[PDB]
Amino acid sequence: GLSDGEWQQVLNVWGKVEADIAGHGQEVLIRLFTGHPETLEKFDKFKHLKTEAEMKASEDLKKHGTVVLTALGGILKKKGHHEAELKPLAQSHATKHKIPIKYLEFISDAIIHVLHSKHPGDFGADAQGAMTKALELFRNDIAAKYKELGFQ
């Protein structure tokens, strides 16, 4: 649950992402894959990537980064009223991709890391607080659907 002022911070930060969605999406996935190499094994189309240089050179990884952040941005713009947008993603990630909630924690922290890396000194403590709360809400509502499905 976020206040109006917190949502305003989230959507202000998101403007930074929308200026370069592919570059942000690429770096988020690279941070996930290099920090948590077990996550790469869930992607049949990226498991061939052995080095970060190959990851950086992969145009399909940048494409998928655009898909991921476009979906997340659509959810964030609903300011919590995201049941219709979130349900299909919860279902596909639990039942088809088999993504444990832990990996959603990993990618949430990766987003925070990338924002500081690309905007050092321009991602203030209030903005980090609000973005963190928004990603916690996203993860918590996914977790509720995971529990319904019995997925661990």
Ligand code: HEM
């Ligand atoms: C912010 C969190 C995430 C968002 C918004 C997101 C979004 C998406 C979307 C929109 C798709 C394509 C449609 C679909 O299959 O539902 C997708 C596919 C997929 N996601 Fe995610 N995802 C997220 C996190 C993760 C994480 C953490 C993992 C694994 C560590 C993951 C694994 C996958 C896989 C394996 C696919 C299929 C890729 C393919 O072969 O095309 N997702 N995701």
